[PDB]
Amino acid sequence: GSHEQFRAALQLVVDPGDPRSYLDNFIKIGEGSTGIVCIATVRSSGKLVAVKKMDLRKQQRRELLFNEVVIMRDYQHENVVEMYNSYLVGDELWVVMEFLEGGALTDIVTHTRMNEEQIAAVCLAVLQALSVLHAQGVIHRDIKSDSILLTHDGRVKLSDFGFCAQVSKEVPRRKSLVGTPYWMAPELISRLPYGPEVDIWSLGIMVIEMVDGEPPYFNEPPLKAMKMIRDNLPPRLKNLHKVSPSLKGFLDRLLVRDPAQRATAAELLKHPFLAKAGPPASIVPLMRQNR
C-alpha cells in the first residue's frame, strides 16, 4: 500500500497521460543511478527531446523523486535545463526535457585541458543558477561535472536536481547524508547541520576537476575518501603550477572548511576571476565532435 501511495502522490504533480503516444524513435543514451535517459522525436514537430525514466521500485529514497519534477518547474533560467512535461508511465516517472547536444561536462574534463577563460565561463554559469536557487533556500547537493550539460554553441546549464532539499525559517539546515562522496562538503560528511554553503564547496571540487581532470582522493574508495575529506585540510591542486593567481584566489574562497567563512554565490559573482569568462563560443572547441 506504500508504493501505490507514492504513485498517486506523484500522479498529482505530473501532467496527465502517456507521452508514448506522441513520441518516436526512442534511443537510449545513458544510465544514471536513478534511471536511464533516451532521446526521442516529437512526431508532430520533429523536434528532439530528452526523456529521463525512473522506476519507483528502484529508488534508494522515493520521496526525492518530487525534486525531479518540482525543481525544474518552479525555476526557469538561462542556466537551468528546461523541462517540457512530466508523466507517470506504468511504475515509471518520465521527465521530458530539453536536449543539450553538447553532453555532460565530465567528458570534457577527462579528455582535454580547459583554459581559464573556459573554466571561468563555466563557474559563472553555475553560480548564476545557484544564486537563484540559494535565494529561495534550495540546496542542490550534487554539484559536479556530471550535473553540468552543454549546448553546441557552448551554453552551460545545471541539471540533475533529484538530490535537492529545501530550507526555510522552520527548517534552517539539512541533516541527511546526500551527494557524491568526493564532492561532498566537510560539514555534510561530518553529519552536521548544513545549508547552501555545501554547494559552494562542491563547485570548488568541480573546479579541481576542470584543472586536474579528477576530484581529490579519487583513487581511494568512497567511504575512505570521505573520511579523508573530513579530517584533512582543503585539498590541493596536483597541477597548481598551471593555474593563475586569479584562479587560485577565487578557489580559496570556495574550499573553506568553515561554511561561515566560505563564500556565497552572490559574493562570488562579483569576484574578479569571473571577468575572464569568455563568450559561449569559447567552449565550442572542447566538445567531442569538434576536438
Ligand X SMILES: Clc1c(CNc2nccc(Nc3cc(C4CC4)[nH]n3)n2)ccc2nc[nH]c12
Binding region: 29-37, 52, 98-100, 160-162
CB of 82 to ligand X, least distance (A): 9
Out of 74, 91, 142, 258, the active site residue is 142
Residue 56: exposure state from Cβ atoms within 10 A (0-12, 13-18, ≥19): middle
Answer yes or no: 258 catalytic: no
- The Cα 72–Cα 78 span in angstroms is 12
Closest separation in Å from C-beta 100 to ligand X: 4
C-beta closer to ligand X: residue 83 or 277? 83
- 50 vs 165, which CB is nearer to ligand X? 50
User: What DSSP element (H or E) covers 9?
Assistant: helix 2-11
Q: Are 126 and 159 in contact (CB under 8 A)?
A: no
Position 30, amino acid: G
What is the smallest separation between the CB atom of 134 and ligand X, expressed in angstroms? 22
Whole-angstrom Cα Rg for the chain: 19
Tell me how far apart the alpha carbons of residues 154 and 223 are, in angstroms, rounded to a whole number: 35
Determine contact, residues 173/195, Cβ cutoff 8 Å.
yes
Nearer CB in complex with ligand X: 35/259:
35
Q: Which residue is nearest to ligand X (CB)?
A: 30
Minimal distance in Å, beta carbon 65 to ligand X? Answer: 15
Q: Which residue has the cell 579519487?
A: 218
Q: CA 236 to CA 44: how far, in whole Å?
A: 52
Rounded Cα distance, 213 and 208, in Å: 7
Residue closer to ligand X by CB (options 110, 244) is: 110
| CB of residue 39 to ligand X, shortest distance in Å | 7
Q: Which CB sits closer to ligand X, 94 or 273?
A: 94
Binding site for ligand X (CB under 6 A): 29-32, 37, 50, 52, 97-100, 103-104, 146, 149, 159-160
Q: Where is the binding site for ATP, in residues? A: 29-37, 52, 98-100, 160-162
CA gap 198, 109 in Å, rounded: 22
71 Cβ neighbours under 8 A, 6+ residues apart: 138, 161, 164
* Active site (catalytic) residues: 142
